[PDB]
Write a protein that binds this ligand. Structure first.
Ligand code: CU
Lengths: 187, 187
């Protein structure tokens, strides 16, 4: 069957960090659910782009499990993800079932908040490094995309294509990732 | 005062081609209006991301003029732009007042439909070349971003950052473009 992705969308999310992975994953034939943290209502992203989620997180979490859970960045978005009990439960379940978790920019700091994937090598946006590294629970990387087993992280809007294609490769393989990449006119 | 951008958003627009320039232009302090071609209602983009426009095109066109008019790509989006009498009027007015027009991916084919900027060097998505070149009214370029005076074109989602930063440079200068670029973690 087709692989399934859950993208958790909170107020203040970085819209580029959100839309590039959603679009690229759908190009890869992944069934993507854009789930609104706060409900079914439109979400005001960090640069004021307003995105209508496919479902509330409350509803989407009942339609699990997912082959990947994706956390976009944006400082305020990531803080909302970090403060959410529902997000904690979803991430802990995904970790327990050995499923992929992918987070970009400030997004990985939600992994710290929910005590997910300690001991992994991770990257973040450079400005989010100190928050991520508080307590030394991860090892930091400056790679544009970092994958330590089932924890996949990346740095920012400018690494969003690389991040998305890494998710595609992890779920659907190298050939599909290459086929999806070519029409994008990347470097 | 601040520069102003009009981004015309139609059903079937490529959401990456839309969101990256909106976000990057807002980072540059440009006042961006995301205007819905069909009205004020949510727009279903090519890969099913749903974006709520800031205003209808009908309303936004009354709040001109704009320092740049931006046409996103997406085959079906560009076709909707190409078929629109309102778009024709906006582009002709912008051309007449010697204002910047920027189009990405299949987007430049709307310039052909509305007879805008004939004689310019342009690029498009590779798959949109034949449509753009019908009649030989432009000269084709394989540059990732092409700027021939007031006609600025680009190739696809993977050139969207370069396209957006070219708009920023054209409106607010090289220094602002460099300052906006650095936090993005581009190549
Ligand atoms: Cu909406």
């Amino acid at each position: 069957a087709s692989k399934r992705a859950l993208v958790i969308l909170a107020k203040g999310a970085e819209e580029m960090d959100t839309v590039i992975p959603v679009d690229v994953m759908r190009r890869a034939g992944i069934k993507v659910t854009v789930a609104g943290l706060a409900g079914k209502d439109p979400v005001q992203c960090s640069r004021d782009v307003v995105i209508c989620p496919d479902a509330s997180l409350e509803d989407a979490k009942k339609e699990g499990p997912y082959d990947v859970v994706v956390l976009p960045g944006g400082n305020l978005g990531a803080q909302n993800l970090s403060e959410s009990a529902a997000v904690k439960e979803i991430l802990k379940e995904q970790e327990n079932r050995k499923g992929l978790i992918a987070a970009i920019c400030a997004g990985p700091t939600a992994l710290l908040a929910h005590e997910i994937g300690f001991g992994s090598k991770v990257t973040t946006h450079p400005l989010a490094k100190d928050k991520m590294m508080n307590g030394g629970h991860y090892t930091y990387s400056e790679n544009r995309v970092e994958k330590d087993g089932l924890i996949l992280t990346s740095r920012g809007p400018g690494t969003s294509f690389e991040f998305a294609l890494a998710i595609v490769e992890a779920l659907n393989g190298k050939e599909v990732a290459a086929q999806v990449k070519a029409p994008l006119v990347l470097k």
